[PDB]
Structure formats: structure tokens, C-alpha cells
Design a protein around this ligand. Sequence first.
Ligand SMILES: [Zn+2]
Length: 427
Amino acid sequence: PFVNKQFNYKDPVNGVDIAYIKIPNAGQMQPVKAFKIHNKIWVIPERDTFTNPEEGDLNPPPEAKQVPVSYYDSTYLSTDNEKDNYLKGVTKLFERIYSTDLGRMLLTSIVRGIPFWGGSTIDTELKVIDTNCINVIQPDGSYRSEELNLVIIGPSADIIQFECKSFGHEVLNLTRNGYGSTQYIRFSPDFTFGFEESLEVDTNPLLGAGKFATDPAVTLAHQLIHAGHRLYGIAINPNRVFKVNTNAYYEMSGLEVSFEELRTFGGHDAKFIDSLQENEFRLYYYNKFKDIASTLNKAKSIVGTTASLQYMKNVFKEKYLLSEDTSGKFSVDKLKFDKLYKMLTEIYTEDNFVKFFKVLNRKTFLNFDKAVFKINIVPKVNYTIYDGFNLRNTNLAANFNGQNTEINNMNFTKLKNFTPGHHHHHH
Ligand SMILES: [Zn+2]
């Protein structure tokens, strides 16, 4: 959310909001410098070769094996100067998101979305799950474990493959049982995608469609919406998909977009989602929340040194908006639940963010990107918190001229065209 202090990648470690950390994952990775820009939210301006053991390096696949919509450069984000621009880029997008009524609400929901303390084998004991924390390095080289909700980190080998990922449990499906888990969003504020479009009326495309660029704040908001679903454990299994056409057959080929995506993008694309199935999930998650309420009600002990049981129960009471009856027993407030669920699944959408931002964006999640563009959003003369690329009092404020890649050509440097025309990428 709003970032109170101005961080520089150079600033010294203070073990509080600027430190070296290790991600709770697998091998003996070497620490990396990280910045806590808001309660529970961290930014690691490094390439992600930690979240997945199958991606320990930045070696690009052979050319013949590369997806049409992909971009590789083992060198991006490897110098302090890039990291510093990464950090300020991400921070500025958070402020742009936070600056809208919709984004302020989403970020508030994300910060209150502490992953549940369901890591004990004893059913009456609350204990944090290790993969929902990071190890902050102390002055004396020792590691101090800290809980967090979100981490913004650089992309893996393919630079434009953005996504929201998290560590799993050996038996619990944290993203789908109402528990939630720390979310790691692979993202870069240094590149954006170009698309075609041009809102017209009846008869006139002599010059062809305009060539525009996607505002990075929308691309980040998209990932954060996924994070919202997952922090609250109400994500939908990606194998659950819906066919999106006409003239096509099922089997889930031709065109079947996952339920998760259609709901995240929203707008005209959220009408292809089966209402009943949608209704079933809300009931299923409402129940998951009820189970959590009983777990809290039956809790007799807690693991950890600083936090007291009552303290944690209250943390979760605020998260899941539970009712605390006349006897102290927690219950799921149907009124408050419905609202929370609705907000998380249908108010927080890419479509709605596009409205608040007043930007041009693909109309249907089913649009095709044409190219990748190098950009630099840090300079206030290139991009602002309130206008993005369509700077006011310049010829960039009308007709999304700021997003137009021909007009505002000094703000977009093409790195590659996506040769085939047909498929997707995603998010
Ligand atoms: Zn998505």
C-alpha cells in the first residue's frame, strides 16, 4: 500500500524494513537484499531462481523450444542500478493502485489476509506454517523468522511470465481450504505488452488499428487480485475451466479458460462462468470458514514466543470477520462473509481497475498481445501515480495517446514482436 519511506537499493540493512533474507524453500540459497514497503509486504529486486528448484538458473531454452510469447535475457536485473529502478518501479505501481478507492480496499484486504496458523499436528494447537515466513538475517548472522503475506520478486528465465505462486503443504491445500499462504508474485515494472485496438463507430479503419501498450499498474493489480483469493484460501483449482466460444466442442480444447482467470479479469468475460458452479464454490468456502471458526473455538494452546493465543484468535477473527457470541465462541457472520467474498471475487477485477485507472486495456481477457516493450516508469516525466502514461497537460492525455506506441514512442522501446498470431500467454 502507501509506502511511507523512500527506499534506495543502496540504503543500509537495519534488520527491520531493509535486510538480507532467505526464502523458506529447499536448498541452501544465499541471502538476498529485501525491502519491507508496508506491513506484511516485501519486495525482493532479484530474479527468481529460488521459488522453484526446477528453475535455479536463467538459462533460456533453445530457440525452437521457446514459447512465441516469451522474452529472455539472463542479464536483466543483475546490477544494483537495475535493482534500484525495479524497487522504485514497484513502489510507484503500488502507490498508483493505492491511489484508487478500489486499490486501497484490495491492499487493505491483502494486508489483513494473514495466512492461517494451521501447521500443528495436535488439533487444539495453533502453530504457524514455516513456508508462510521468511528468515531475516540478524547482525550476528543468525536467522530471525518473520511472517509476511506478500512478496514482490523479479521474473525467472522468461522475463514476461508474471504470476502469483506460493509454497504448498504436504497435505493441506492452503490456497483452497480458506487458510491461505504467503504469495510470491513474479513481476517486472520494466517491460510491458503491446496490443492493437481503436474504439470507433460505424465505417472507418483506413489507417488500421492503433498500437498501444498495457499500463503496468493493471498488470500488477491483476496479480494482486490472484493474491487476494489465495491469501484467503478461496482460489479455484485451475483444472476447473469453462469453454468460451460457440462453434467449438467441449473436451476442454478449442477454448476453455480457467474459472480462476475469468473471475480475475471480470467484466464481459465473467458472464461465461456457470452461475451454479459459482454458487457451489461460495457455499464450499463458507464452510471452510466455518471449520476455521471451530478450530479457533477448540484451540487450547499455541506455539511461538511473542504471540498469545487470544491474540492470534483475534487476528483471525478480524481476518475472516467472525462473530464472537455472548460466550466468546466464534461464528461466521453471513452478512459480513457474503460481502467479503463478493468483494474478493467480483469487485476486485482487472475490468474494474481499468475503469478506475481510466486506461485503455484489452477488452476481453481473450485478446492477443503483439510485442514486448522496454519501458521506464520511474521518471515522473514518463509516468505518474495519477495518470500513468497519459500525462495531463501534454498531448498524451487525450485518446490514451500516452499508451499509444507510435505517438509516445519515446516511452516504449520494442524488443521483440510475437511472430505467430493466434494463442495467448496469460494473465
Ligand atoms: Zn491471472
